[PDB]
């Protein structure tokens, strides 16, 4: 229950934030958390993109994080989405998370101007010295247009002892190979987690540690088994899980996440199909697609 505790293996769920009639729906949230825990999920990432952090206010954040830690009761680490534009807003969010008893924070690259690799290093360094929390670097160039180079991540690994790992959401095989190789040469136990469900198998085969997952919101058993079968030497069985997850993995992104994942959870009876603007509930097409995909998947 701490220090190496944030070095989870396998699946960390980027959990949605259920709403009902404008307010947090903590009752539904608790049912979803138990779905995750019961199925072997090894971490929760709270208030990331999937959790609609941009539309959840300061008090709601507090109540959601506190309820999360209550249900989990130190069984698995709870990591809180905390990165924003300025190092001002970020650190405060990191402080809030720490004050509440979260185990780590997920910290996105700054985006404004033309962040250099030194810029990125200096960003994680300042946060690093000002917290005792585990810090996860979030590299997501497809969204930000900013890429943490594998050598930059390895510097971070070498120098910043409380940076535990990287959520590597650059899907490129050439980046993944080197992110894994170089960061673990700099620190044996620096964690590399896939930031893309469909790259999970590839990243594991490359020597990585699991996935920070959208798909495990609806299919935690399956995503857990993908990782577990790999770590047991059964690639054939691991591949097979990956193969069968492909339709679901594709369906959850036919609209902007978390739009489809919330529609799917609602079909499955876990939550209200309610999103905060500018996100909107999924189209009937998305819903019918999800209905069929979830039925084939045996989840409905």
PDB file of C-alpha atoms in Angstrom:
ATOM      1  CA  UNK A   1       0.000   0.000   0.000  1.00  0.00           C
ATOM      2  CA  UNK A   2       2.436   2.631  -1.409  1.00  0.00           C
ATOM      3  CA  UNK A   3       5.837   3.501  -3.076  1.00  0.00           C
ATOM      4  CA  UNK A   4       6.121   0.440  -5.348  1.00  0.00           C
ATOM      5  CA  UNK A   5       2.279   0.251  -5.138  1.00  0.00           C
ATOM      6  CA  UNK A   6       1.812   2.537  -8.179  1.00  0.00           C
ATOM      7  CA  UNK A   7       3.870   0.101 -10.340  1.00  0.00           C
ATOM      8  CA  UNK A   8       0.781  -1.903 -11.329  1.00  0.00           C
ATOM      9  CA  UNK A   9       0.810  -4.643 -13.994  1.00  0.00           C
ATOM     10  CA  UNK A  10      -1.872  -5.460 -16.516  1.00  0.00           C
ATOM     11  CA  UNK A  11      -4.966  -3.325 -16.677  1.00  0.00           C
ATOM     12  CA  UNK A  12      -5.537   0.136 -15.264  1.00  0.00           C
ATOM     13  CA  UNK A  13      -9.056   1.345 -16.113  1.00  0.00           C
ATOM     14  CA  UNK A  14      -9.549   4.941 -17.236  1.00  0.00           C
ATOM     15  CA  UNK A  15     -12.937   4.958 -15.554  1.00  0.00           C
ATOM     16  CA  UNK A  16     -15.901   7.085 -16.642  1.00  0.00           C
ATOM     17  CA  UNK A  17     -17.573   9.641 -14.389  1.00  0.00           C
ATOM     18  CA  UNK A  18     -21.289   8.657 -14.233  1.00  0.00           C
ATOM     19  CA  UNK A  19     -23.796  11.511 -14.077  1.00  0.00           C
ATOM     20  CA  UNK A  20     -27.521  11.575 -13.470  1.00  0.00           C
ATOM     21  CA  UNK A  21     -29.662  14.689 -13.930  1.00  0.00           C
ATOM     22  CA  UNK A  22     -26.667  17.041 -13.834  1.00  0.00           C
ATOM     23  CA  UNK A  23     -25.012  15.597 -10.738  1.00  0.00           C
ATOM     24  CA  UNK A  24     -22.454  12.909  -9.997  1.00  0.00           C
ATOM     25  CA  UNK A  25     -24.058   9.510  -9.802  1.00  0.00           C
ATOM     26  CA  UNK A  26     -21.919   7.960  -7.074  1.00  0.00           C
ATOM     27  CA  UNK A  27     -24.327   5.021  -6.663  1.00  0.00           C
ATOM     28  CA  UNK A  28     -23.783   3.929 -10.284  1.00  0.00           C
ATOM     29  CA  UNK A  29     -20.058   4.776  -9.969  1.00  0.00           C
ATOM     30  CA  UNK A  30     -19.746   2.335  -7.077  1.00  0.00           C
ATOM     31  CA  UNK A  31     -21.359  -0.474  -9.085  1.00  0.00           C
ATOM     32  CA  UNK A  32     -18.845   0.188 -11.901  1.00  0.00           C
ATOM     33  CA  UNK A  33     -15.858   0.224  -9.511  1.00  0.00           C
ATOM     34  CA  UNK A  34     -16.943  -3.171  -8.103  1.00  0.00           C
ATOM     35  CA  UNK A  35     -17.283  -4.517 -11.663  1.00  0.00           C
ATOM     36  CA  UNK A  36     -13.613  -3.479 -12.131  1.00  0.00           C
ATOM     37  CA  UNK A  37     -12.290  -4.831  -8.815  1.00  0.00           C
ATOM     38  CA  UNK A  38     -14.087  -8.185  -9.085  1.00  0.00           C
ATOM     39  CA  UNK A  39     -12.579  -8.777 -12.545  1.00  0.00           C
ATOM     40  CA  UNK A  40      -8.869  -8.428 -11.700  1.00  0.00           C
ATOM     41  CA  UNK A  41      -8.294  -4.828 -12.812  1.00  0.00           C
ATOM     42  CA  UNK A  42      -5.040  -3.635 -11.161  1.00  0.00           C
ATOM     43  CA  UNK A  43      -5.429   0.160 -11.094  1.00  0.00           C
ATOM     44  CA  UNK A  44      -7.966   2.932 -11.601  1.00  0.00           C
ATOM     45  CA  UNK A  45      -7.259   6.121 -13.443  1.00  0.00           C
ATOM     46  CA  UNK A  46      -9.812   8.651 -12.284  1.00  0.00           C
ATOM     47  CA  UNK A  47     -10.666  11.937 -14.029  1.00  0.00           C
ATOM     48  CA  UNK A  48      -8.682  11.349 -17.202  1.00  0.00           C
ATOM     49  CA  UNK A  49     -10.246  12.147 -20.608  1.00  0.00           C
ATOM     50  CA  UNK A  50     -12.537   9.126 -20.330  1.00  0.00           C
ATOM     51  CA  UNK A  51     -13.779  10.570 -17.022  1.00  0.00           C
ATOM     52  CA  UNK A  52     -14.747  13.948 -18.548  1.00  0.00           C
ATOM     53  CA  UNK A  53     -12.340  15.870 -16.316  1.00  0.00           C
ATOM     54  CA  UNK A  54     -12.863  19.156 -18.252  1.00  0.00           C
ATOM     55  CA  UNK A  55     -16.563  19.277 -17.202  1.00  0.00           C
ATOM     56  CA  UNK A  56     -16.228  18.052 -13.600  1.00  0.00           C
ATOM     57  CA  UNK A  57     -15.867  20.911 -11.083  1.00  0.00           C
ATOM     58  CA  UNK A  58     -13.408  21.170  -8.170  1.00  0.00           C
ATOM     59  CA  UNK A  59     -15.854  19.867  -5.521  1.00  0.00           C
ATOM     60  CA  UNK A  60     -17.083  17.029  -7.729  1.00  0.00           C
ATOM     61  CA  UNK A  61     -13.436  15.951  -8.283  1.00  0.00           C
ATOM     62  CA  UNK A  62     -12.975  15.782  -4.521  1.00  0.00           C
ATOM     63  CA  UNK A  63     -16.092  13.695  -3.932  1.00  0.00           C
ATOM     64  CA  UNK A  64     -15.337  11.334  -6.820  1.00  0.00           C
ATOM     65  CA  UNK A  65     -11.709  10.745  -5.740  1.00  0.00           C
ATOM     66  CA  UNK A  66     -12.695  10.315  -2.070  1.00  0.00           C
ATOM     67  CA  UNK A  67     -15.458   7.852  -2.936  1.00  0.00           C
ATOM     68  CA  UNK A  68     -13.019   5.950  -5.194  1.00  0.00           C
ATOM     69  CA  UNK A  69     -10.466   5.545  -2.392  1.00  0.00           C
ATOM     70  CA  UNK A  70     -13.238   4.432   0.002  1.00  0.00           C
ATOM     71  CA  UNK A  71     -14.465   1.583  -2.206  1.00  0.00           C
ATOM     72  CA  UNK A  72     -10.985   0.473  -3.283  1.00  0.00           C
ATOM     73  CA  UNK A  73      -9.705   0.506   0.347  1.00  0.00           C
ATOM     74  CA  UNK A  74      -6.038   0.261  -0.746  1.00  0.00           C
ATOM     75  CA  UNK A  75      -6.589  -2.977  -2.760  1.00  0.00           C
ATOM     76  CA  UNK A  76      -5.282  -1.321  -5.993  1.00  0.00           C
ATOM     77  CA  UNK A  77      -3.651   2.100  -6.714  1.00  0.00           C
ATOM     78  CA  UNK A  78      -5.811   5.085  -7.620  1.00  0.00           C
ATOM     79  CA  UNK A  79      -4.191   7.517 -10.078  1.00  0.00           C
ATOM     80  CA  UNK A  80      -5.820  10.918 -10.716  1.00  0.00           C
ATOM     81  CA  UNK A  81      -5.829  12.816 -14.039  1.00  0.00           C
ATOM     82  CA  UNK A  82      -4.115  16.122 -13.232  1.00  0.00           C
ATOM     83  CA  UNK A  83      -2.349  17.572 -16.251  1.00  0.00           C
ATOM     84  CA  UNK A  84      -3.393  20.858 -17.814  1.00  0.00           C
ATOM     85  CA  UNK A  85      -1.843  23.724 -19.807  1.00  0.00           C
ATOM     86  CA  UNK A  86       0.051  25.698 -17.143  1.00  0.00           C
ATOM     87  CA  UNK A  87       2.306  24.242 -14.448  1.00  0.00           C
ATOM     88  CA  UNK A  88       0.250  26.481 -12.138  1.00  0.00           C
ATOM     89  CA  UNK A  89      -3.101  24.689 -12.593  1.00  0.00           C
ATOM     90  CA  UNK A  90      -1.384  21.263 -12.724  1.00  0.00           C
ATOM     91  CA  UNK A  91       0.524  21.411  -9.434  1.00  0.00           C
ATOM     92  CA  UNK A  92      -2.609  22.553  -7.546  1.00  0.00           C
ATOM     93  CA  UNK A  93      -4.552  19.610  -8.988  1.00  0.00           C
ATOM     94  CA  UNK A  94      -1.613  17.362  -7.993  1.00  0.00           C
ATOM     95  CA  UNK A  95      -1.759  18.881  -4.491  1.00  0.00           C
ATOM     96  CA  UNK A  96      -5.530  18.257  -4.290  1.00  0.00           C
ATOM     97  CA  UNK A  97      -4.971  14.603  -5.337  1.00  0.00           C
ATOM     98  CA  UNK A  98      -2.185  14.192  -2.743  1.00  0.00           C
ATOM     99  CA  UNK A  99      -4.241  15.860   0.031  1.00  0.00           C
ATOM    100  CA  UNK A 100      -7.037  13.370  -0.698  1.00  0.00           C
ATOM    101  CA  UNK A 101      -4.820  10.282  -0.430  1.00  0.00           C
ATOM    102  CA  UNK A 102      -4.562   9.268  -4.110  1.00  0.00           C
ATOM    103  CA  UNK A 103      -1.558   7.058  -4.896  1.00  0.00           C
ATOM    104  CA  UNK A 104      -0.452   8.828  -8.106  1.00  0.00           C
ATOM    105  CA  UNK A 105      -1.251  11.373 -10.805  1.00  0.00           C
ATOM    106  CA  UNK A 106      -1.454  11.196 -14.598  1.00  0.00           C
ATOM    107  CA  UNK A 107       0.252  14.209 -16.124  1.00  0.00           C
ATOM    108  CA  UNK A 108      -0.149  15.215 -19.801  1.00  0.00           C
ATOM    109  CA  UNK A 109       2.548  17.068 -21.761  1.00  0.00           C
ATOM    110  CA  UNK A 110       2.093  20.843 -21.866  1.00  0.00           C
ATOM    111  CA  UNK A 111       0.883  21.846 -25.349  1.00  0.00           C
ATOM    112  CA  UNK A 112       1.232  25.581 -25.975  1.00  0.00           C
ATOM    113  CA  UNK A 113       3.933  27.270 -28.097  1.00  0.00           C
ATOM    114  CA  UNK A 114       6.281  24.572 -29.438  1.00  0.00           C
ATOM    115  CA  UNK A 115       7.369  22.541 -26.380  1.00  0.00           C
ATOM    116  CA  UNK A 116      10.945  21.360 -26.767  1.00  0.00           C
ATOM    117  CA  UNK A 117      12.246  18.125 -25.246  1.00  0.00           C
ATOM    118  CA  UNK A 118      14.012  20.160 -22.545  1.00  0.00           C
ATOM    119  CA  UNK A 119      10.735  22.001 -21.986  1.00  0.00           C
ATOM    120  CA  UNK A 120       8.988  18.662 -21.352  1.00  0.00           C
ATOM    121  CA  UNK A 121      11.778  17.395 -19.071  1.00  0.00           C
ATOM    122  CA  UNK A 122      11.687  20.667 -17.063  1.00  0.00           C
ATOM    123  CA  UNK A 123       7.894  20.404 -16.772  1.00  0.00           C
ATOM    124  CA  UNK A 124       7.996  16.947 -15.177  1.00  0.00           C
ATOM    125  CA  UNK A 125      11.003  17.968 -13.049  1.00  0.00           C
ATOM    126  CA  UNK A 126       9.209  20.883 -11.351  1.00  0.00           C
ATOM    127  CA  UNK A 127       6.168  18.699 -10.544  1.00  0.00           C
ATOM    128  CA  UNK A 128       8.476  15.885  -9.456  1.00  0.00           C
ATOM    129  CA  UNK A 129      10.186  17.857  -6.669  1.00  0.00           C
ATOM    130  CA  UNK A 130       6.894  19.326  -5.387  1.00  0.00           C
ATOM    131  CA  UNK A 131       5.065  16.014  -4.744  1.00  0.00           C
ATOM    132  CA  UNK A 132       5.525  12.655  -3.036  1.00  0.00           C
ATOM    133  CA  UNK A 133       2.968  11.084  -5.398  1.00  0.00           C
ATOM    134  CA  UNK A 134       3.760   8.651  -8.189  1.00  0.00           C
ATOM    135  CA  UNK A 135       3.746  10.539 -11.478  1.00  0.00           C
ATOM    136  CA  UNK A 136       2.744   9.008 -14.783  1.00  0.00           C
ATOM    137  CA  UNK A 137       3.898  10.791 -17.939  1.00  0.00           C
ATOM    138  CA  UNK A 138       1.044  10.946 -20.463  1.00  0.00           C
ATOM    139  CA  UNK A 139       2.357  11.007 -24.048  1.00  0.00           C
ATOM    140  CA  UNK A 140      -0.513  11.513 -26.461  1.00  0.00           C
ATOM    141  CA  UNK A 141       0.732  13.301 -29.612  1.00  0.00           C
ATOM    142  CA  UNK A 142      -2.339  12.292 -31.675  1.00  0.00           C
ATOM    143  CA  UNK A 143      -4.308  14.697 -29.492  1.00  0.00           C
ATOM    144  CA  UNK A 144      -1.705  17.321 -28.420  1.00  0.00           C
ATOM    145  CA  UNK A 145       0.653  17.238 -31.391  1.00  0.00           C
ATOM    146  CA  UNK A 146       3.494  16.975 -28.837  1.00  0.00           C
ATOM    147  CA  UNK A 147       5.561  13.777 -28.631  1.00  0.00           C
ATOM    148  CA  UNK A 148       7.824  12.811 -25.717  1.00  0.00           C
ATOM    149  CA  UNK A 149      10.818  11.233 -27.500  1.00  0.00           C
ATOM    150  CA  UNK A 150      11.894   7.841 -26.113  1.00  0.00           C
ATOM    151  CA  UNK A 151      15.242   9.411 -25.081  1.00  0.00           C
ATOM    152  CA  UNK A 152      13.411  12.194 -23.221  1.00  0.00           C
ATOM    153  CA  UNK A 153      11.312   9.597 -21.333  1.00  0.00           C
ATOM    154  CA  UNK A 154      14.553   7.763 -20.483  1.00  0.00           C
ATOM    155  CA  UNK A 155      16.047  11.011 -19.023  1.00  0.00           C
ATOM    156  CA  UNK A 156      12.916  11.376 -16.951  1.00  0.00           C
ATOM    157  CA  UNK A 157      13.282   7.723 -15.865  1.00  0.00           C
ATOM    158  CA  UNK A 158      16.956   8.240 -14.918  1.00  0.00           C
ATOM    159  CA  UNK A 159      16.577  11.572 -13.061  1.00  0.00           C
ATOM    160  CA  UNK A 160      13.094  11.859 -11.610  1.00  0.00           C
ATOM    161  CA  UNK A 161      12.695   9.092  -9.058  1.00  0.00           C
ATOM    162  CA  UNK A 162       9.002   9.695  -8.330  1.00  0.00           C
ATOM    163  CA  UNK A 163       7.989   9.488 -12.022  1.00  0.00           C
ATOM    164  CA  UNK A 164       6.837   5.842 -12.009  1.00  0.00           C
ATOM    165  CA  UNK A 165       6.168   5.296 -15.674  1.00  0.00           C
ATOM    166  CA  UNK A 166       4.693   6.491 -18.890  1.00  0.00           C
ATOM    167  CA  UNK A 167       1.248   6.071 -20.403  1.00  0.00           C
ATOM    168  CA  UNK A 168       2.480   5.758 -24.001  1.00  0.00           C
ATOM    169  CA  UNK A 169      -0.404   6.766 -26.258  1.00  0.00           C
ATOM    170  CA  UNK A 170       1.741   7.193 -29.377  1.00  0.00           C
ATOM    171  CA  UNK A 171       0.637   4.043 -31.242  1.00  0.00           C
ATOM    172  CA  UNK A 172       3.626   3.900 -33.606  1.00  0.00           C
ATOM    173  CA  UNK A 173       5.506   0.619 -33.304  1.00  0.00           C
ATOM    174  CA  UNK A 174       8.824   2.458 -33.812  1.00  0.00           C
ATOM    175  CA  UNK A 175       8.160   4.687 -30.782  1.00  0.00           C
ATOM    176  CA  UNK A 176       6.850   1.841 -28.577  1.00  0.00           C
ATOM    177  CA  UNK A 177       9.936  -0.356 -29.209  1.00  0.00           C
ATOM    178  CA  UNK A 178      12.237   2.475 -28.118  1.00  0.00           C
ATOM    179  CA  UNK A 179      10.098   3.839 -25.239  1.00  0.00           C
ATOM    180  CA  UNK A 180      10.258   0.345 -23.697  1.00  0.00           C
ATOM    181  CA  UNK A 181      13.952  -0.343 -24.564  1.00  0.00           C
ATOM    182  CA  UNK A 182      15.430   2.994 -23.516  1.00  0.00           C
ATOM    183  CA  UNK A 183      13.421   3.762 -20.365  1.00  0.00           C
ATOM    184  CA  UNK A 184      14.137   0.348 -18.825  1.00  0.00           C
ATOM    185  CA  UNK A 185      17.870   0.671 -19.656  1.00  0.00           C
ATOM    186  CA  UNK A 186      17.792   3.948 -17.665  1.00  0.00           C
ATOM    187  CA  UNK A 187      15.726   2.372 -14.838  1.00  0.00           C
ATOM    188  CA  UNK A 188      14.999  -1.347 -14.712  1.00  0.00           C
ATOM    189  CA  UNK A 189      11.494  -1.002 -13.224  1.00  0.00           C
ATOM    190  CA  UNK A 190      10.233   2.169 -15.021  1.00  0.00           C
ATOM    191  CA  UNK A 191       6.751   1.242 -16.180  1.00  0.00           C
ATOM    192  CA  UNK A 192       5.519   1.476 -19.750  1.00  0.00           C
ATOM    193  CA  UNK A 193       1.806   1.198 -20.244  1.00  0.00           C
ATOM    194  CA  UNK A 194      -0.028   1.325 -23.517  1.00  0.00           C
ATOM    195  CA  UNK A 195      -2.337   4.322 -23.839  1.00  0.00           C
ATOM    196  CA  UNK A 196      -4.228   2.541 -26.619  1.00  0.00           C
ATOM    197  CA  UNK A 197      -6.237  -0.627 -26.099  1.00  0.00           C
ATOM    198  CA  UNK A 198      -5.464  -1.898 -29.649  1.00  0.00           C
ATOM    199  CA  UNK A 199      -1.695  -1.537 -29.056  1.00  0.00           C
ATOM    200  CA  UNK A 200      -1.724  -3.496 -25.819  1.00  0.00           C
ATOM    201  CA  UNK A 201      -0.674  -6.854 -27.288  1.00  0.00           C
ATOM    202  CA  UNK A 202       2.080  -5.213 -29.353  1.00  0.00           C
ATOM    203  CA  UNK A 203       3.419  -3.264 -26.340  1.00  0.00           C
ATOM    204  CA  UNK A 204       3.490  -6.352 -24.146  1.00  0.00           C
ATOM    205  CA  UNK A 205       5.411  -8.295 -26.827  1.00  0.00           C
ATOM    206  CA  UNK A 206       7.810  -5.340 -26.904  1.00  0.00           C
ATOM    207  CA  UNK A 207       8.552  -5.735 -23.158  1.00  0.00           C
ATOM    208  CA  UNK A 208       5.989  -3.307 -21.630  1.00  0.00           C
ATOM    209  CA  UNK A 209       3.768  -3.554 -18.573  1.00  0.00           C
ATOM    210  CA  UNK A 210       0.077  -3.376 -19.487  1.00  0.00           C
ATOM    211  CA  UNK A 211      -2.460  -0.769 -20.486  1.00  0.00           C
ATOM    212  CA  UNK A 212      -4.355   2.284 -19.256  1.00  0.00           C
ATOM    213  CA  UNK A 213      -7.606   1.139 -20.834  1.00  0.00           C
ATOM    214  CA  UNK A 214     -10.949   2.572 -22.055  1.00  0.00           C
ATOM    215  CA  UNK A 215     -12.242  -0.868 -23.106  1.00  0.00           C
ATOM    216  CA  UNK A 216     -11.945  -2.387 -19.609  1.00  0.00           C
ATOM    217  CA  UNK A 217     -14.755  -0.073 -18.449  1.00  0.00           C
ATOM    218  CA  UNK A 218     -17.116  -2.485 -20.274  1.00  0.00           C
ATOM    219  CA  UNK A 219     -14.923  -5.599 -20.684  1.00  0.00           C
ATOM    220  CA  UNK A 220     -12.563  -5.833 -17.666  1.00  0.00           C
ATOM    221  CA  UNK A 221     -12.448  -9.655 -17.628  1.00  0.00           C
ATOM    222  CA  UNK A 222     -11.320  -9.781 -21.279  1.00  0.00           C
ATOM    223  CA  UNK A 223      -8.696  -6.991 -21.030  1.00  0.00           C
ATOM    224  CA  UNK A 224      -7.390  -8.573 -17.822  1.00  0.00           C
ATOM    225  CA  UNK A 225      -7.089 -11.996 -19.533  1.00  0.00           C
ATOM    226  CA  UNK A 226      -5.240 -10.508 -22.556  1.00  0.00           C
ATOM    227  CA  UNK A 227      -2.486  -9.308 -20.203  1.00  0.00           C
ATOM    228  CA  UNK A 228      -2.568 -12.329 -17.889  1.00  0.00           C
ATOM    229  CA  UNK A 229      -2.302 -14.886 -20.728  1.00  0.00           C
ATOM    230  CA  UNK A 230       0.702 -12.945 -22.083  1.00  0.00           C
ATOM    231  CA  UNK A 231       2.523 -12.828 -18.731  1.00  0.00           C
ATOM    232  CA  UNK A 232       2.024 -16.621 -18.582  1.00  0.00           C
ATOM    233  CA  UNK A 233       3.760 -17.311 -21.896  1.00  0.00           C
ATOM    234  CA  UNK A 234       0.552 -18.148 -23.724  1.00  0.00           C
ATOM    235  CA  UNK A 235       0.740 -15.760 -26.690  1.00  0.00           C
ATOM    236  CA  UNK A 236      -1.689 -17.826 -28.720  1.00  0.00           C
ATOM    237  CA  UNK A 237      -4.370 -17.381 -26.003  1.00  0.00           C
ATOM    238  CA  UNK A 238      -3.407 -13.688 -25.476  1.00  0.00           C
ATOM    239  CA  UNK A 239      -3.620 -13.059 -29.270  1.00  0.00           C
ATOM    240  CA  UNK A 240      -6.950 -14.774 -29.366  1.00  0.00           C
ATOM    241  CA  UNK A 241      -8.334 -12.389 -26.716  1.00  0.00           C
ATOM    242  CA  UNK A 242      -6.975  -9.436 -28.754  1.00  0.00           C
ATOM    243  CA  UNK A 243      -8.496 -10.892 -31.909  1.00  0.00           C
ATOM    244  CA  UNK A 244     -11.959 -11.233 -30.307  1.00  0.00           C
ATOM    245  CA  UNK A 245     -11.769  -7.755 -28.715  1.00  0.00           C
ATOM    246  CA  UNK A 246     -11.223  -6.020 -32.081  1.00  0.00           C
ATOM    247  CA  UNK A 247     -14.902  -5.259 -32.846  1.00  0.00           C
ATOM    248  CA  UNK A 248     -15.468  -3.831 -29.351  1.00  0.00           C
ATOM    249  CA  UNK A 249     -12.123  -2.000 -29.497  1.00  0.00           C
ATOM    250  CA  UNK A 250     -13.215  -0.420 -32.751  1.00  0.00           C
ATOM    251  CA  UNK A 251     -16.833   0.301 -31.716  1.00  0.00           C
ATOM    252  CA  UNK A 252     -15.802   2.319 -28.628  1.00  0.00           C
ATOM    253  CA  UNK A 253     -14.163   4.952 -30.824  1.00  0.00           C
ATOM    254  CA  UNK A 254     -16.753   5.490 -33.645  1.00  0.00           C
ATOM    255  CA  UNK A 255     -17.605   8.691 -31.735  1.00  0.00           C
ATOM    256  CA  UNK A 256     -15.346  10.641 -29.356  1.00  0.00           C
ATOM    257  CA  UNK A 257     -14.575   8.665 -26.187  1.00  0.00           C
ATOM    258  CA  UNK A 258     -16.332   8.549 -23.666  1.00  0.00           C
ATOM    259  CA  UNK A 259     -19.505   8.900 -25.815  1.00  0.00           C
ATOM    260  CA  UNK A 260     -19.680   5.228 -26.934  1.00  0.00           C
ATOM    261  CA  UNK A 261     -18.271   3.743 -23.713  1.00  0.00           C
ATOM    262  CA  UNK A 262     -21.069   5.475 -21.725  1.00  0.00           C
ATOM    263  CA  UNK A 263     -23.727   4.236 -24.175  1.00  0.00           C
ATOM    264  CA  UNK A 264     -22.288   0.723 -23.786  1.00  0.00           C
ATOM    265  CA  UNK A 265     -22.259   0.876 -19.968  1.00  0.00           C
ATOM    266  CA  UNK A 266     -25.891   2.088 -20.088  1.00  0.00           C
ATOM    267  CA  UNK A 267     -26.983  -0.837 -22.308  1.00  0.00           C
ATOM    268  CA  UNK A 268     -25.239  -3.073 -19.743  1.00  0.00           C
ATOM    269  CA  UNK A 269     -27.232  -1.454 -16.896  1.00  0.00           C
ATOM    270  CA  UNK A 270     -24.369   0.227 -15.021  1.00  0.00           C
ATOM    271  CA  UNK A 271     -25.070   3.966 -15.585  1.00  0.00           C
ATOM    272  CA  UNK A 272     -27.321   6.652 -17.059  1.00  0.00           C
ATOM    273  CA  UNK A 273     -26.423   7.466 -20.656  1.00  0.00           C
ATOM    274  CA  UNK A 274     -25.625  11.042 -19.653  1.00  0.00           C
ATOM    275  CA  UNK A 275     -22.715  13.214 -20.766  1.00  0.00           C
ATOM    276  CA  UNK A 276     -21.863  16.837 -20.095  1.00  0.00           C
ATOM    277  CA  UNK A 277     -21.798  19.244 -23.031  1.00  0.00           C
ATOM    278  CA  UNK A 278     -20.155  19.559 -25.514  1.00  0.00           C
ATOM    279  CA  UNK A 279     -20.290  15.726 -25.477  1.00  0.00           C
ATOM    280  CA  UNK A 280     -23.694  14.244 -26.380  1.00  0.00           C
ATOM    281  CA  UNK A 281     -25.241  10.765 -26.014  1.00  0.00           C
ATOM    282  CA  UNK A 282     -24.339   8.375 -28.833  1.00  0.00           C
ATOM    283  CA  UNK A 283     -26.314   8.189 -32.088  1.00  0.00           C
ATOM    284  CA  UNK A 284     -28.803   5.321 -32.613  1.00  0.00           C
ATOM    285  CA  UNK A 285     -26.331   3.848 -35.127  1.00  0.00           C
ATOM    286  CA  UNK A 286     -23.552   3.810 -32.504  1.00  0.00           C
ATOM    287  CA  UNK A 287     -26.041   2.279 -30.042  1.00  0.00           C
ATOM    288  CA  UNK A 288     -27.212  -0.479 -32.468  1.00  0.00           C
ATOM    289  CA  UNK A 289     -23.551  -1.155 -33.379  1.00  0.00           C
ATOM    290  CA  UNK A 290     -22.729  -1.383 -29.666  1.00  0.00           C
ATOM    291  CA  UNK A 291     -25.765  -3.615 -29.015  1.00  0.00           C
ATOM    292  CA  UNK A 292     -24.635  -6.143 -31.660  1.00  0.00           C
ATOM    293  CA  UNK A 293     -20.954  -5.963 -30.709  1.00  0.00           C
ATOM    294  CA  UNK A 294     -21.743  -6.382 -26.990  1.00  0.00           C
ATOM    295  CA  UNK A 295     -24.063  -9.343 -27.774  1.00  0.00           C
ATOM    296  CA  UNK A 296     -21.360 -11.141 -29.816  1.00  0.00           C
ATOM    297  CA  UNK A 297     -18.868 -10.311 -27.042  1.00  0.00           C
ATOM    298  CA  UNK A 298     -21.174 -12.064 -24.542  1.00  0.00           C
ATOM    299  CA  UNK A 299     -21.438  -8.892 -22.425  1.00  0.00           C
ATOM    300  CA  UNK A 300     -25.097  -8.372 -23.330  1.00  0.00           C
TER     301      UNK A 300
END
